[PDB]
Design an enzyme around this catalytic site. Structure first.
Site, PDB file in Angstrom:
ATOM      1  N   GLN B  11       7.630 -17.696  25.211  1.00 42.06           N
ATOM      2  CA  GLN B  11       6.571 -18.659  24.935  1.00 42.06           C
ATOM      3  C   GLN B  11       6.642 -19.843  25.891  1.00 42.06           C
ATOM      4  OE1 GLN B  11       6.882 -20.309  21.003  1.00 42.06           O
ATOM      5  NE2 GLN B  11       5.142 -21.699  21.277  1.00 42.06           N
ATOM      6  N   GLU B 254      16.610 -17.913  52.753  1.00 47.03           N
ATOM      7  CA  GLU B 254      16.886 -19.223  53.327  1.00 47.03           C
ATOM      8  C   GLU B 254      17.258 -20.223  52.243  1.00 47.03           C
ATOM      9  OE1 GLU B 254      13.257 -19.572  55.353  1.00 47.03           O
ATOM     10  OE2 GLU B 254      13.963 -18.613  57.199  1.00 47.03           O
TER      11      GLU B 254
HETATM   12  C1  LIG Z   1      28.388 -25.443  51.270  1.00 47.01           C
HETATM   13  O1  LIG Z   1      27.336 -24.543  51.479  1.00 47.01           O
HETATM   14  C2  LIG Z   1      26.613 -24.777  52.659  1.00 47.01           C
HETATM   15  C3  LIG Z   1      25.264 -24.513  52.694  1.00 47.01           C
HETATM   16  C4  LIG Z   1      24.543 -24.736  53.854  1.00 47.01           C
HETATM   17  C5  LIG Z   1      25.153 -25.226  55.007  1.00 47.01           C
HETATM   18  C6  LIG Z   1      24.343 -25.474  56.286  1.00 47.01           C
HETATM   19  C7  LIG Z   1      23.445 -24.298  56.694  1.00 47.01           C
HETATM   20  N1  LIG Z   1      24.255 -23.104  56.877  1.00 47.01           N
HETATM   21  C8  LIG Z   1      25.323 -22.133  57.048  1.00 47.01           C
HETATM   22  O2  LIG Z   1      26.451 -22.526  57.767  1.00 47.01           O
HETATM   23  C9  LIG Z   1      25.299 -20.733  56.438  1.00 47.01           C
HETATM   24  C10 LIG Z   1      25.652 -19.672  57.138  1.00 47.01           C
HETATM   25  C11 LIG Z   1      25.637 -18.308  56.446  1.00 47.01           C
HETATM   26  C12 LIG Z   1      24.960 -17.154  57.176  1.00 47.01           C
HETATM   27  C13 LIG Z   1      25.479 -15.804  56.659  1.00 47.01           C
HETATM   28  C14 LIG Z   1      26.986 -15.773  56.441  1.00 47.01           C
HETATM   29  C15 LIG Z   1      25.029 -14.619  57.505  1.00 47.01           C
HETATM   30  O3  LIG Z   1      24.782 -13.553  56.729  1.00 47.01           O
HETATM   31  C16 LIG Z   1      23.582 -14.159  57.049  1.00 47.01           C
HETATM   32  C17 LIG Z   1      22.257 -13.441  57.279  1.00 47.01           C
HETATM   33  C18 LIG Z   1      21.556 -13.680  58.439  1.00 47.01           C
HETATM   34  C19 LIG Z   1      20.360 -13.046  58.685  1.00 47.01           C
HETATM   35  C20 LIG Z   1      19.853 -12.154  57.751  1.00 47.01           C
HETATM   36  C21 LIG Z   1      20.557 -11.903  56.571  1.00 47.01           C
HETATM   37  C22 LIG Z   1      21.769 -12.553  56.336  1.00 47.01           C
HETATM   38  O4  LIG Z   1      23.617 -17.236  56.791  1.00 47.01           O
HETATM   39  C23 LIG Z   1      22.725 -17.497  57.837  1.00 47.01           C
HETATM   40  O5  LIG Z   1      22.937 -17.121  58.943  1.00 47.01           O
HETATM   41  C24 LIG Z   1      21.468 -18.287  57.489  1.00 47.01           C
HETATM   42  C25 LIG Z   1      20.445 -18.412  58.619  1.00 47.01           C
HETATM   43  C26 LIG Z   1      19.135 -17.710  58.250  1.00 47.01           C
HETATM   44  C27 LIG Z   1      18.905 -16.443  59.070  1.00 47.01           C
HETATM   45  C28 LIG Z   1      19.005 -17.468  56.745  1.00 47.01           C
HETATM   46  O6  LIG Z   1      21.876 -19.523  56.952  1.00 47.01           O
HETATM   47  C29 LIG Z   1      21.822 -20.658  57.774  1.00 47.01           C
HETATM   48  O7  LIG Z   1      22.550 -20.774  58.706  1.00 47.01           O
HETATM   49  C30 LIG Z   1      20.829 -21.775  57.435  1.00 47.01           C
HETATM   50  C31 LIG Z   1      19.500 -21.262  56.875  1.00 47.01           C
HETATM   51  C32 LIG Z   1      20.661 -22.781  58.576  1.00 47.01           C
HETATM   52  N2  LIG Z   1      21.384 -24.010  58.279  1.00 47.01           N
HETATM   53  C33 LIG Z   1      22.681 -24.603  57.988  1.00 47.01           C
HETATM   54  O8  LIG Z   1      23.242 -25.483  58.925  1.00 47.01           O
HETATM   55  C34 LIG Z   1      26.528 -25.488  54.958  1.00 47.01           C
HETATM   56  C35 LIG Z   1      27.251 -25.262  53.787  1.00 47.01           C
HETATM   57 CL1  LIG Z   1      29.003 -25.602  53.742  1.00 47.01          CL
HETATM   58  N1  LIG Z   2       9.734 -27.938  28.441  1.00 48.39           N
HETATM   59  C1  LIG Z   2       9.392 -27.062  27.487  1.00 48.39           C
HETATM   60  N2  LIG Z   2      10.324 -26.574  26.669  1.00 48.39           N
HETATM   61  C2  LIG Z   2       9.809 -25.705  25.767  1.00 48.39           C
HETATM   62  C3  LIG Z   2       8.497 -25.305  25.626  1.00 48.39           C
HETATM   63  N3  LIG Z   2       8.373 -24.397  24.582  1.00 48.39           N
HETATM   64  C4  LIG Z   2       9.592 -24.273  24.116  1.00 48.39           C
HETATM   65  N4  LIG Z   2      10.510 -25.036  24.790  1.00 48.39           N
HETATM   66  C5  LIG Z   2      11.939 -25.107  24.517  1.00 48.39           C
HETATM   67  O1  LIG Z   2      12.514 -23.863  24.845  1.00 48.39           O
HETATM   68  C6  LIG Z   2      13.595 -23.557  23.925  1.00 48.39           C
HETATM   69  C7  LIG Z   2      13.334 -22.222  23.269  1.00 48.39           C
HETATM   70  O2  LIG Z   2      12.121 -21.637  23.810  1.00 48.39           O
HETATM   71  P1  LIG Z   2      10.980 -21.160  22.786  1.00 48.39           P
HETATM   72  O3  LIG Z   2       9.680 -21.052  23.511  1.00 48.39           O
HETATM   73  O4  LIG Z   2      11.035 -22.005  21.557  1.00 48.39           O
HETATM   74  O5  LIG Z   2      11.482 -19.681  22.420  1.00 48.39           O
HETATM   75  P2  LIG Z   2      10.899 -18.230  22.766  1.00 48.39           P
HETATM   76  O6  LIG Z   2      11.179 -17.936  24.202  1.00 48.39           O
HETATM   77  O7  LIG Z   2       9.502 -18.137  22.252  1.00 48.39           O
HETATM   78  O8  LIG Z   2      11.827 -17.295  21.857  1.00 48.39           O
HETATM   79  P3  LIG Z   2      11.589 -16.579  20.431  1.00 48.39           P
HETATM   80  O9  LIG Z   2      11.043 -17.647  19.515  1.00 48.39           O
HETATM   81  O10 LIG Z   2      12.934 -16.064  19.985  1.00 48.39           O
HETATM   82  O11 LIG Z   2      10.599 -15.472  20.691  1.00 48.39           O
HETATM   83  C8  LIG Z   2      13.684 -24.762  22.978  1.00 48.39           C
HETATM   84  O12 LIG Z   2      14.658 -25.698  23.425  1.00 48.39           O
HETATM   85  C9  LIG Z   2      12.271 -25.343  23.048  1.00 48.39           C
HETATM   86  O13 LIG Z   2      12.212 -26.709  22.705  1.00 48.39           O
HETATM   87  C10 LIG Z   2       7.511 -25.824  26.499  1.00 48.39           C
HETATM   88  O14 LIG Z   2       6.297 -25.575  26.517  1.00 48.39           O
HETATM   89  N5  LIG Z   2       8.063 -26.716  27.418  1.00 48.39           N
END
Ligand SMILES: COc1ccc(C[C@@H]2NC(=O)/C=C/C[C@@H]([C@H](C)[C@H]3O[C@@H]3c3ccccc3)OC(=O)[C@H](CC(C)C)OC(=O)[C@H](C)CNC2=O)cc1Cl
Ligand SMILES: Nc1nc2c(ncn2[C@@H]2O[C@H](COP(=O)(O)OP(=O)(O)OP(=O)(O)O)[C@@H](O)[C@H]2O)c(=O)[nH]1
Ligand SMILES: Nc1nc2c(ncn2[C@@H]2O[C@H](COP(=O)(O)OP(=O)(O)O)[C@@H](O)[C@H]2O)c(=O)[nH]1
EC number: 3.6.5.-
Lengths: 427, 436
Positions: B11, B254
């Protein structure tokens, strides 16, 4: 004429290699159209090693450019030699080079490298004789290292009786960002060591520390780096390009240079370093040149060689000076700096002189060293990886696409082994 | 082309879906008819907004998303509302029996007997699209539906689509609007079974939003209308990056990369500065530096926690309209001056920035006062420990008395299983404690 096939990949690799090729072509004087517009006949005597021949007698450099982001020629034409490379072998990827090893090294891109290997194999045989392979890239993560060391493995598989060479660049956390790279580097070099014996470690950290602090820069751009590298790693191969005393071939370069099958990380330097200024500068003298030779700041690596000892040193002077007097200051350096060299290896000073001067410079000299000094850089890159391995950051993708933790640990073990070898051979 | 699918369970989930979707349709210049902005009018668009809406023959930009609940109480209540023809009739599912705050009710009683239809509908919708990136989840901890059905559904999705990422927009529950005292039980029972499938989750705190709607929005009795509209606004302020243009935090991958270091810990805090109340004309003016520096204040942090007492891990922002980078960088430098903020000792922790060229769009007949500047901090601060530990404490108070245990037991749970989950989240609290 033992020709060389040039391998090259990666965004940074292509950036550096474009300016390198421009520098070498300009020094050799071939027009940016692709015709000999040099200024003598001492240029094309044997230079077919880098520059092949076309049907219309125009020359044609042979060098492969590959990647995984589809647009490379769109960026290769950013200089002045776009169409100059033969326009049928700009093999392009589809996705890009996110900093993810094994995203090019195991599954995708690896599919493309089979065709890449077929194309390079077809490319090789046409020459009269083969010298070997040499590669320009950076140890930077994101399809930069994967494709590199991968293609190293297959080329070493296909031609064991040739020589590899790497112009790789060590990344560093001073100029750059996106810090997951320590993984990428300290894992790729982990098998680069076994796979190659001919390396130049152009420290990007050192390039910044010398280009921004004491070179009058404020924000070092990438062309700024490209100038210095396309100077030094273009002057490194003049001995190959120009006949002279130490004409040593790749194999002979190694046997003169590499004592052990692993301790092969050369740390280069270049005395007349110059930011991009059209005016050349005031003149310099030979003793000043050979003193700025060992300038610790001048070193393209992360250490001061005063802090360590050398193993096998080369040097290539260039210009017009005292040819036969250079031995005087070579032996002067030897006598006054015996401690800098090692007693285990006597006569470690192979020296030569090349008549030709570089473009936009009269007196200069490319340098090559081989010292324990790079132990400092390796300790840096090892700590800057081990201090963060405890938190297991970002290994999700690596552990999902085909790596495992034991691989990380054994890479750390190998690099601690290399630093131990450097340390003990210093002891 | 690319695309994404937003799921709507519960909900609360479907109420927030209605509010958000209507706001998004308004913002892009789309209308409850969706006549045409400036485009081909048939398979057109080509901007980023196409990733949510896709044009039919009439160029209607149908939002390829679904709404789910186990009782036809609210689903129909909005199916004959403002956006009757915006969504496809017989594309909104209605259950029969309410989960009635019983997690096992949604997990092994009634949701288990219907989930097949939901899977068929979402798979057909994916077949309709071509560029799916991931999933956007709108659910809640407290409700039986929004927890049990959520967990089981996302488990099925992770089974069949094992590659795409997914983002969860849950609601952290508060006593002041609590409608159950089994609410911590359902919260733990679902979240202990999320990390294995969840990728990133944006949970919003009811007490925090309530304090926002009162202390600044000038309300004393906020209904679901007020809280829901405010959270829809903040969710829009978050997802604007995906809505408009290439900038910081464009893709879900990203998102997680910029945000999530370690796969288990993927709960990032969020903020949105403009909470300026209403038609109250003008007491002061606006400023980029003003709102940027006031962002760090605990005022608007989506979940009540103490960030200044905890080490940071990253910092992202986003800005609406009135673009000029220079003063943005100046403001960053001014706030950079290390009053008490800290960061991670082993990685760069720069204040990543991506700006947008559109001022915020406010609902045409609602409380919020029109503004043109905005920030949206997606900080990955570790200080959500406090809140998680508070919920865990409220949990384990009622386990010595074995309270309410039989109610969940009767449908196929296990008594000692709760202890396993409690130890799991004690270990997660230890994991937060690890960073020091
Ligand atoms: C504490 O957490 C942090 C969070 C962010 C930052 C800074 C932040 N990043 C990193 O050092 C993370 C490195 C990881 C790396 C991993 C390990 C490689 O497999 C990745 C991969 C690459 C291509 C396709 C699929 C997977 O990913 C990436 O290559 C991506 C770049 C793009 C292509 C999403 O990421 C970045 O670099 C972002 C977008 C550019 N910016 C940053 O300078 C530092 C810290 Cl310490
Ligand atoms: N911000 C926000 N919180 C909501 C809203 N509706 C419910 N909540 C909160 O969400 C929590 C539970 O979600 P509900 O929508 O009540 O529950 P439900 O997902 O319908 O679950 P069931 O009743 O078991 O089917 C409670 O903390 C509610 O106060 C809404 O429209 N906005
Ligand atoms: N030496 C050098 N390094 C660069 C350059 N551009 C970027 N770098 C850094 O060095 C590495 C470049 O290699 P790589 O990551 O393969 O580049 P990519 O292909 O763009 O991902 C990265 O870590 C960059 O941060 C450049 O022009 N020269």
């Amino acid at each position: 004429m033992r020709e060389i096939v040039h391998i090259q990949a990666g965004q940074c690799g292509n950036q550096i290699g474009a300016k390198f090729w421009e520098v070498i072509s300009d020094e050799h004087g071939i027009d940016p159209s692709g015709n000999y517009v040099g200024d003598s006949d001492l240029q094309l005597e044997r230079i077919s090693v880098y520059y092949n021949e076309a049907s219309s007698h125009k020359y044609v450099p042979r060098a492969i450019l590959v990647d995984l982001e589809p647009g490379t020629m769109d960026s290769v034409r950013s200089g002045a030699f776009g169409h100059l490379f033969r326009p049928d072998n700009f093999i392009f990827g589809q996705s890009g080079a996110g900093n993810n090893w094994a995203k090019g090294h195991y599954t995708e891109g690896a599919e493309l490298v089979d065709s890449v290997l077929d194309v390079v194999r077809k490319e090789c045989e046409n020459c009269d004789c083969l010298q070997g392979f040499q590669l320009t890239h950076s140890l930077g993560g994101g399809t930069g290292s994967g494709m590199g060391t991968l293609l190293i493995s297959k080329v070493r598989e296909e031609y064991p009786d040739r020589i590899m060479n790497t112009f790789s660049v060590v990344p560093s956390p001073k100029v750059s960002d996106t810090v997951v790279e320590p993984y990428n580097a300290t894992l790729s070099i982990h098998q680069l060591v076994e796979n190659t014996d001919e390396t130049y470690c152009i420290d990007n950290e050192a390039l910044y520390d010398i280009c921004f602090r004491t070179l009058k820069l404020a924000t070092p751009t990438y062309g700024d780096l490209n100038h210095l590298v396309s100077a030094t790693m273009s002057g490194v191969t003049t001995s190959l390009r120009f006949p002279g005393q130490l004409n040593a071939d790749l194999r002979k370069l190694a046997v003169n240079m590499v004592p052990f099958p692993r301790l092969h990380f050369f740390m280069p330097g270049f005395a007349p370093l110059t930011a991009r200024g059209s005016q050349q500068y005031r003149a310099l003298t030979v003793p000043e040149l050979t003193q700025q030779m060992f300038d610790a700041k001048n070193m393209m690596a992360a250490c001061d060689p005063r802090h360590g000892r050398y193993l096998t040193v080369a040097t290539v002077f260039r210009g017009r000076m005292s040819m036969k007097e250079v031995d005087e200051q070579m032996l002067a350096i030897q006598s006054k700096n015996s401690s800098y060299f090692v007693e285990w290896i006597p006569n470690n000073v192979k020296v030569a002189v090349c008549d030709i001067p570089p473009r936009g410079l009269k007196m200069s000299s490319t340098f090559i060293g081989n010292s324990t000094a790079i132990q400092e850089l390796f300790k840096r890159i090892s700590e800057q990886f081990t201090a963060m391995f405890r938190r297991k950051a970002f290994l999700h993708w690596y552990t999902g696409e085909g790596m495992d933790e034991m691989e990380f640990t054994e890479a750390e073990s190998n690099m601690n082994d290399l630093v131990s070898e450097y340390q003990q051979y210093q002891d | 082309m690319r695309e994404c699918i937003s799921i709507h369970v519960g909900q609360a989930g479907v109420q927030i879906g209605n509010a958000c979707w209507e706001l998004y349709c308004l913002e892009h210049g789309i209308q409850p008819d969706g006549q045409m902005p400036s485009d081909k009018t048939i398979g057109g668009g080509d901007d980023s907004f196409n990733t949510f809406f896709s044009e039919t023959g009439a160029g209607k930009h149908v939002p390829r998303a679904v709404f789910v609940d186990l009782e036809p109480t609210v689903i129909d209540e909005v199916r004959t509302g403002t956006y009757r023809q915006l969504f496809h009739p017989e594309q909104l599912i209605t259950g029969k029996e309410d989960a009635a705050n019983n997690y096992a009710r949604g997990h092994y009683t009634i949701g288990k007997e219907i989930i097949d239809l939901v899977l068929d509908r979402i798979r057909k919708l994916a077949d309709q699209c071509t560029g799916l990136q991931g999933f956007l989840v709108f659910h809640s901890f407290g409700g039986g539906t929004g927890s049990g059905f959520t967990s089981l559904l996302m488990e099925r999705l992770s089974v069949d689509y094992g590659k795409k990422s997914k983002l969860e927009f849950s609601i952290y529950p508060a006593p002041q609007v609590s409608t159950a005292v089994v609410e911590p039980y359902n919260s733990i029972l679902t979240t202990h079974t999320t990390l294995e499938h969840s990728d990133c989750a944006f949970m919003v705190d009811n007490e925090a939003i309530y304090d926002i709607c009162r202390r600044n929005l000038d309300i004393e009795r906020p209904t679901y209308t007020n809280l829901n509209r405010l959270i829809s606004q903040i969710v829009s302020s978050i997802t604007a990056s995906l809505r408009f243009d290439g900038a910081l935090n464009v893709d879900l991958t990203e998102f997680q990369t910029n945000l999530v270091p370690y796969p288990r810990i993927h709960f990032p805090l969020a903020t949105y500065a403009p909470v300026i109340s209403a038609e109250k004309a003008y007491h002061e003016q606006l400023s980029v530096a003003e709102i940027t520096n006031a962002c760090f204040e605990p005022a608007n942090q989506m979940v009540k926690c103490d960030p200044r007492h905890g080490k940071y891990m990253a910092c992202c922002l986003l800005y609406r309209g009135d673009v000029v980078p220079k003063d943005v960088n100046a403001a960053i430098a001014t706030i950079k001056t290390k009053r008490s903020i800290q960061f991670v000792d082993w990685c760069p922790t720069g204040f990543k920035v991506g700006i947008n060229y559109q001022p915020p769009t406010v609902v045409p007949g609602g409380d919020l006062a029109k503004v043109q500047r905005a920030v949206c901090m997606l900080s990955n601060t570790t200080a959500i420990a406090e809140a998680w530990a508070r919920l865990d404490h409220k949990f384990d108070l009622m386990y010595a008395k074995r309270a309410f245990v039989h109610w969940y037991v009767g449908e196929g749970m296990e008594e000692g299983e709760f202890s396993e989950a409690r130890e799991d989240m004690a270990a997660l609290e230890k994991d937060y404690e690890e960073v020091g």
